[PDB]
Protein backbone atom coordinates (compact mmCIF):
# COMPACT_ATOMS: atom_id res chain seq x y z
CA UNK A 1 0.00 0.00 0.00
CA UNK A 2 1.13 3.55 -0.79
CA UNK A 3 -1.42 5.75 1.05
CA UNK A 4 -1.50 8.33 -1.75
CA UNK A 5 -3.34 11.44 -0.60
CA UNK A 6 -6.46 10.92 1.46
CA UNK A 7 -7.37 7.40 2.61
CA UNK A 8 -11.05 7.01 1.79
CA UNK A 9 -13.04 4.45 3.76
CA UNK A 10 -14.41 1.46 1.84
CA UNK A 11 -16.88 -1.20 2.96
CA UNK A 12 -15.44 -4.25 1.21
CA UNK A 13 -17.47 -7.41 1.80
CA UNK A 14 -16.48 -10.79 0.43
CA UNK A 15 -17.06 -14.51 0.68
CA UNK A 16 -15.61 -17.81 -0.42
CA UNK A 17 -16.66 -19.09 -3.82
CA UNK A 18 -19.91 -21.06 -3.38
CA UNK A 19 -19.84 -24.78 -4.12
CA UNK A 20 -22.13 -27.79 -3.88
CA UNK A 21 -20.37 -28.78 -0.65
CA UNK A 22 -20.78 -25.30 0.89
CA UNK A 23 -23.64 -23.35 -0.70
CA UNK A 24 -24.03 -19.74 0.45
CA UNK A 25 -20.76 -19.42 2.42
CA UNK A 26 -20.52 -16.84 5.22
CA UNK A 27 -20.09 -13.20 4.25
CA UNK A 28 -17.24 -11.18 5.76
CA UNK A 29 -17.39 -7.38 5.94
CA UNK A 30 -14.22 -5.33 6.33
CA UNK A 31 -13.48 -1.68 7.09
CA UNK A 32 -10.71 -0.83 4.61
CA UNK A 33 -9.11 2.61 4.31
CA UNK A 34 -7.45 2.98 0.91
CA UNK A 35 -6.78 5.74 -1.64
CA UNK A 36 -8.88 3.96 -4.29
CA UNK A 37 -11.15 0.94 -4.59
CA UNK A 38 -8.51 -1.11 -6.42
CA UNK A 39 -6.21 -0.91 -3.40
CA UNK A 40 -9.21 -1.41 -1.10
CA UNK A 41 -10.03 -4.69 -2.83
CA UNK A 42 -6.37 -5.72 -2.56
CA UNK A 43 -6.16 -4.73 1.11
CA UNK A 44 -9.25 -6.87 1.70
CA UNK A 45 -7.54 -10.01 0.40
CA UNK A 46 -4.61 -9.26 2.73
CA UNK A 47 -6.44 -8.90 6.05
CA UNK A 48 -9.07 -11.56 5.32
CA UNK A 49 -6.65 -14.14 3.92
CA UNK A 50 -4.80 -14.02 7.25
CA UNK A 51 -8.00 -14.33 9.33
CA UNK A 52 -9.92 -16.92 7.29
CA UNK A 53 -8.80 -19.61 4.85
CA UNK A 54 -9.72 -17.79 1.64
CA UNK A 55 -7.52 -16.23 -1.03
CA UNK A 56 -8.43 -13.92 -3.91
CA UNK A 57 -8.91 -16.97 -6.14
CA UNK A 58 -10.61 -19.09 -3.47
CA UNK A 59 -13.27 -16.42 -2.94
CA UNK A 60 -14.84 -13.31 -4.45
CA UNK A 61 -15.64 -9.73 -3.49
CA UNK A 62 -19.37 -9.12 -3.19
CA UNK A 63 -19.44 -5.35 -2.57
CA UNK A 64 -16.84 -2.57 -2.46
CA UNK A 65 -18.18 0.95 -2.02
CA UNK A 66 -17.31 4.22 -0.35
CA UNK A 67 -18.33 4.89 3.25
CA UNK A 68 -19.10 8.59 3.48
CA UNK A 69 -18.83 10.61 6.68
CA UNK A 70 -22.16 10.95 8.46
CA UNK A 71 -21.12 14.25 10.12
CA UNK A 72 -18.49 16.03 8.00
CA UNK A 73 -19.16 19.35 9.78
CA UNK A 74 -18.70 18.10 13.36
CA UNK A 75 -15.33 17.97 15.11
CA UNK A 76 -14.84 14.45 16.45
CA UNK A 77 -12.20 12.67 18.52
CA UNK A 78 -10.98 9.49 16.83
CA UNK A 79 -9.28 6.68 18.72
CA UNK A 80 -7.32 4.40 16.41
CA UNK A 81 -6.03 0.97 17.42
CA UNK A 82 -3.23 -0.18 15.14
CA UNK A 83 -0.21 -2.47 14.93
CA UNK A 84 2.99 -1.70 13.06
CA UNK A 85 6.22 -3.57 12.39
CA UNK A 86 9.24 -1.51 13.42
CA UNK A 87 12.84 -2.38 12.54
CA UNK A 88 12.93 -4.75 15.54
CA UNK A 89 9.43 -6.11 16.13
CA UNK A 90 5.67 -5.61 15.97
CA UNK A 91 3.96 -3.31 18.47
CA UNK A 92 0.33 -2.69 19.33
CA UNK A 93 -0.39 1.03 19.48
CA UNK A 94 -3.37 3.25 20.28
CA UNK A 95 -3.34 6.80 18.91
CA UNK A 96 -5.91 9.59 19.19
CA UNK A 97 -6.66 12.11 16.45
CA UNK A 98 -9.13 14.95 15.96
CA UNK A 99 -10.58 15.47 12.48
CA UNK A 100 -13.90 16.15 10.77
CA UNK A 101 -14.08 12.85 8.86
CA UNK A 102 -13.06 9.30 9.71
CA UNK A 103 -11.03 8.99 6.51
CA UNK A 104 -9.25 12.21 7.45
CA UNK A 105 -8.30 10.89 10.88
CA UNK A 106 -6.97 7.63 9.44
CA UNK A 107 -5.01 9.66 6.89
CA UNK A 108 -3.49 11.64 9.76
CA UNK A 109 -2.50 8.34 11.39
CA UNK A 110 -0.46 7.22 8.38
CA UNK A 111 1.25 10.61 8.16
CA UNK A 112 1.93 10.50 11.91
CA UNK A 113 3.08 6.87 12.08
CA UNK A 114 5.62 7.61 9.36
CA UNK A 115 6.76 10.85 10.98
CA UNK A 116 7.21 9.69 14.57
CA UNK A 117 8.01 6.00 14.01
CA UNK A 118 9.29 5.89 10.39
CA UNK A 119 6.55 3.37 9.60
CA UNK A 120 5.68 2.80 5.95
CA UNK A 121 2.12 2.27 4.76
CA UNK A 122 2.65 -1.45 4.14
CA UNK A 123 3.82 -1.98 7.74
CA UNK A 124 0.73 -0.38 9.34
CA UNK A 125 -2.39 -2.44 10.06
CA UNK A 126 -5.30 -0.30 11.24
CA UNK A 127 -7.28 -2.57 13.56
CA UNK A 128 -10.03 -0.33 14.94
CA UNK A 129 -11.26 3.23 14.33
CA UNK A 130 -13.81 4.60 16.78
CA UNK A 131 -15.34 8.01 17.44
CA UNK A 132 -14.29 8.65 21.05
CA UNK A 133 -16.13 11.06 23.31
CA UNK A 134 -14.18 13.91 24.87
CA UNK A 135 -14.54 12.25 28.29
CA UNK A 136 -12.73 9.09 27.13
CA UNK A 137 -9.70 10.70 25.45
CA UNK A 138 -6.34 9.58 26.86
CA UNK A 139 -3.82 11.76 25.00
CA UNK A 140 -3.10 15.21 26.49
CA UNK A 141 -2.53 16.81 23.08
CA UNK A 142 -6.17 16.05 22.23
CA UNK A 143 -7.59 17.03 25.63
CA UNK A 144 -6.15 20.54 25.36
CA UNK A 145 -8.61 21.27 22.53
CA UNK A 146 -11.39 20.02 24.84
CA UNK A 147 -11.66 23.43 26.51
CA UNK A 148 -14.72 25.59 25.97
CA UNK A 149 -13.89 29.27 25.54
CA UNK A 150 -10.55 28.28 24.04
CA UNK A 151 -8.37 31.30 23.29
CA UNK A 152 -4.90 31.61 21.77
CA UNK A 153 -3.27 34.11 19.40
CA UNK A 154 -1.19 33.38 16.33
CA UNK A 155 2.24 34.49 17.57
CA UNK A 156 5.23 35.05 15.27
CA UNK A 157 3.49 34.68 11.92
CA UNK A 158 6.03 33.09 9.58
CA UNK A 159 6.18 35.09 6.37
CA UNK A 160 4.82 33.28 3.34
CA UNK A 161 4.75 34.78 -0.16
CA UNK A 162 8.51 35.19 0.26
CA UNK A 163 8.95 35.53 -3.51
CA UNK A 164 5.92 37.58 -4.61
CA UNK A 165 8.05 40.58 -3.79
CA UNK A 166 11.39 38.79 -3.96
CA UNK A 167 13.18 42.09 -3.27
CA UNK A 168 11.63 44.88 -1.21
CA UNK A 169 12.60 47.76 1.05
CA UNK A 170 10.11 46.53 3.67
CA UNK A 171 11.16 43.95 6.20
CA UNK A 172 8.16 41.72 6.97
CA UNK A 173 6.13 42.12 10.13
CA UNK A 174 5.48 38.98 12.17
CA UNK A 175 3.01 40.45 14.68
CA UNK A 176 -0.67 40.67 13.76
Amino acid sequence: MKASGTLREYKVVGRLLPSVKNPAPPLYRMRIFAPNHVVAKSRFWYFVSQLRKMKKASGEIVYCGLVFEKSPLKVKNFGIWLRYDSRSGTHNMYREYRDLTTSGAVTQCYRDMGARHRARAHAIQIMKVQVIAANKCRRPAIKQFHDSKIKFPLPHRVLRRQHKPRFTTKRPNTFF
Binding site: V13, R15, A24, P25, P26, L27, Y28, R29, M30, R31, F47, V48, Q50, L51, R52, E60, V62, W81, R83, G89, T90, H91, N92, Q125, I126, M127, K128
Partner: protein, 157 residues
Amino acid sequence: TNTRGKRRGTRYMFARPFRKHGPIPLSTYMRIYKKGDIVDIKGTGTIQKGMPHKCYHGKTGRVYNVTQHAVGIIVNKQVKGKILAKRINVRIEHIKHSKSRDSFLQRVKENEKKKVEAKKEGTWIELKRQPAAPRPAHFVSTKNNKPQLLEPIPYEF
Protein backbone atom coordinates in the same frame (compact mmCIF):
# COMPACT_ATOMS: atom_id res chain seq x y z
CA THR B 1 33.56 -33.71 -11.89
CA ASN B 2 30.76 -36.26 -11.65
CA THR B 3 30.81 -39.88 -12.77
CA ARG B 4 29.04 -41.03 -15.94
CA GLY B 5 27.49 -44.04 -14.22
CA LYS B 6 24.15 -45.26 -15.50
CA ARG B 7 22.50 -44.98 -12.06
CA ARG B 8 24.25 -41.97 -10.52
CA GLY B 9 21.67 -39.92 -8.64
CA THR B 10 18.95 -42.60 -8.80
CA ARG B 11 18.89 -43.17 -5.03
CA TYR B 12 15.25 -42.09 -4.67
CA MET B 13 13.70 -42.38 -8.14
CA PHE B 14 14.36 -46.11 -8.56
CA ALA B 15 13.61 -46.87 -4.90
CA ARG B 16 10.22 -48.23 -3.97
CA PRO B 17 7.53 -46.37 -2.01
CA PHE B 18 7.42 -46.78 1.75
CA ARG B 19 5.70 -50.03 2.74
CA LYS B 20 5.40 -50.91 -0.96
CA HIS B 21 8.42 -53.20 -1.29
CA GLY B 22 8.42 -56.90 -2.14
CA PRO B 23 7.15 -58.55 -5.31
CA ILE B 24 5.62 -56.56 -8.14
CA PRO B 25 1.80 -56.90 -8.21
CA LEU B 26 0.99 -59.18 -11.11
CA SER B 27 -1.63 -56.90 -12.69
CA THR B 28 1.28 -54.85 -14.03
CA TYR B 29 2.56 -57.95 -15.82
CA MET B 30 -0.79 -58.79 -17.46
CA ARG B 31 -1.35 -55.39 -19.09
CA ILE B 32 -1.41 -55.44 -22.89
CA TYR B 33 0.75 -52.86 -24.67
CA LYS B 34 -0.03 -52.68 -28.39
CA LYS B 35 1.78 -50.55 -30.98
CA GLY B 36 1.21 -46.80 -30.96
CA ASP B 37 -0.30 -46.44 -27.48
CA ILE B 38 0.91 -43.78 -25.05
CA VAL B 39 2.81 -45.14 -22.03
CA ASP B 40 4.70 -43.56 -19.14
CA ILE B 41 8.19 -44.55 -17.99
CA LYS B 42 8.78 -45.10 -14.26
CA GLY B 43 11.77 -47.30 -13.51
CA THR B 44 11.74 -49.72 -10.58
CA GLY B 45 14.80 -50.87 -8.67
CA THR B 46 13.25 -54.29 -8.00
CA ILE B 47 13.53 -55.40 -11.63
CA GLN B 48 17.17 -54.74 -12.50
CA LYS B 49 16.61 -56.08 -16.03
CA GLY B 50 15.45 -53.86 -18.88
CA MET B 51 15.65 -50.68 -16.84
CA PRO B 52 15.28 -47.31 -18.57
CA HIS B 53 17.92 -44.68 -18.05
CA LYS B 54 17.34 -41.95 -15.47
CA CYS B 55 16.74 -39.43 -18.26
CA TYR B 56 13.59 -41.33 -19.26
CA HIS B 57 12.12 -41.73 -15.76
CA GLY B 58 9.02 -39.55 -15.89
CA LYS B 59 9.02 -39.19 -19.68
CA THR B 60 6.22 -40.35 -21.95
CA GLY B 61 6.33 -41.96 -25.38
CA ARG B 62 4.50 -44.31 -27.71
CA VAL B 63 5.13 -48.01 -28.28
CA TYR B 64 6.55 -49.12 -31.63
CA ASN B 65 7.80 -52.65 -30.85
CA VAL B 66 6.46 -55.34 -28.51
CA THR B 67 8.46 -58.34 -27.31
CA GLN B 68 8.06 -61.23 -24.86
CA HIS B 69 8.83 -59.33 -21.65
CA ALA B 70 9.44 -55.78 -22.89
CA VAL B 71 8.24 -53.03 -25.22
CA GLY B 72 9.95 -50.60 -27.57
CA ILE B 73 9.14 -46.95 -26.87
CA ILE B 74 9.84 -43.83 -28.93
CA VAL B 75 10.69 -41.15 -26.38
CA ASN B 76 11.73 -37.53 -26.81
CA LYS B 77 15.00 -36.56 -25.13
CA GLN B 78 16.52 -33.07 -25.21
CA VAL B 79 20.30 -33.45 -25.24
CA LYS B 80 21.48 -29.84 -25.26
CA GLY B 81 19.22 -27.76 -27.50
CA LYS B 82 17.76 -30.40 -29.79
CA ILE B 83 15.04 -32.96 -29.05
CA LEU B 84 15.69 -36.45 -30.40
CA ALA B 85 13.34 -39.42 -30.82
CA LYS B 86 14.92 -42.19 -28.74
CA ARG B 87 13.99 -45.84 -29.34
CA ILE B 88 14.50 -47.50 -25.95
CA ASN B 89 13.79 -51.07 -24.84
CA VAL B 90 12.05 -51.17 -21.45
CA ARG B 91 10.49 -54.14 -19.70
CA ILE B 92 6.82 -53.82 -18.77
CA GLU B 93 7.59 -53.49 -15.05
CA HIS B 94 8.96 -49.97 -15.61
CA ILE B 95 6.09 -48.66 -17.78
CA LYS B 96 2.36 -48.10 -17.47
CA HIS B 97 -0.50 -46.96 -19.68
CA SER B 98 -0.64 -43.17 -19.95
CA LYS B 99 -4.02 -41.65 -19.09
CA SER B 100 -3.04 -38.48 -20.96
CA ARG B 101 -4.91 -39.34 -24.17
CA ASP B 102 -7.72 -41.08 -22.25
CA SER B 103 -9.33 -37.71 -21.58
CA PHE B 104 -9.09 -37.00 -25.32
CA LEU B 105 -10.55 -40.34 -26.39
CA GLN B 106 -13.33 -39.82 -23.84
CA ARG B 107 -14.12 -36.46 -25.44
CA VAL B 108 -13.92 -37.86 -28.98
CA LYS B 109 -16.57 -40.48 -28.23
CA GLU B 110 -18.59 -37.85 -26.36
CA ASN B 111 -18.29 -35.39 -29.25
CA GLU B 112 -19.52 -38.05 -31.68
CA LYS B 113 -22.29 -38.86 -29.18
CA LYS B 114 -23.56 -35.26 -28.99
CA LYS B 115 -23.33 -34.30 -32.67
CA VAL B 116 -25.36 -37.29 -33.88
CA GLU B 117 -28.04 -36.00 -31.51
CA ALA B 118 -27.94 -32.72 -33.46
CA LYS B 119 -28.53 -34.61 -36.71
CA LYS B 120 -31.57 -36.14 -34.98
CA GLU B 121 -32.79 -33.06 -33.08
CA GLY B 122 -31.54 -30.01 -34.99
CA THR B 123 -29.32 -28.16 -32.51
CA TRP B 124 -25.80 -26.72 -32.59
CA ILE B 125 -24.48 -27.41 -29.08
CA GLU B 126 -20.86 -26.26 -29.10
CA LEU B 127 -18.31 -29.05 -28.68
CA LYS B 128 -15.17 -26.92 -28.26
CA ARG B 129 -13.68 -26.61 -24.81
CA GLN B 130 -13.56 -23.12 -23.34
CA PRO B 131 -11.30 -21.57 -20.69
CA ALA B 132 -12.84 -20.58 -17.38
CA ALA B 133 -15.10 -17.70 -18.38
CA PRO B 134 -15.61 -14.68 -16.12
CA ARG B 135 -18.15 -15.35 -13.40
CA PRO B 136 -21.65 -14.27 -14.52
CA ALA B 137 -23.72 -11.74 -12.63
CA HIS B 138 -25.33 -13.22 -9.52
CA PHE B 139 -27.27 -12.03 -6.48
CA VAL B 140 -25.72 -12.70 -3.07
CA SER B 141 -28.48 -12.98 -0.48
CA THR B 142 -28.04 -11.84 3.12
CA LYS B 143 -31.28 -13.32 4.49
CA ASN B 144 -29.69 -15.68 7.02
CA ASN B 145 -26.09 -14.73 6.10
CA LYS B 146 -25.20 -11.31 7.45
CA PRO B 147 -21.71 -9.95 6.63
CA GLN B 148 -19.52 -10.52 9.68
CA LEU B 149 -17.17 -7.69 10.60
CA LEU B 150 -13.56 -8.88 10.59
CA GLU B 151 -10.70 -6.91 12.14
CA PRO B 152 -6.95 -7.51 12.28
CA ILE B 153 -6.05 -9.08 15.63
CA PRO B 154 -3.52 -7.36 17.93
CA TYR B 155 0.05 -8.59 17.98
CA GLU B 156 1.09 -11.28 20.47
CA PHE B 157 4.70 -12.35 21.01
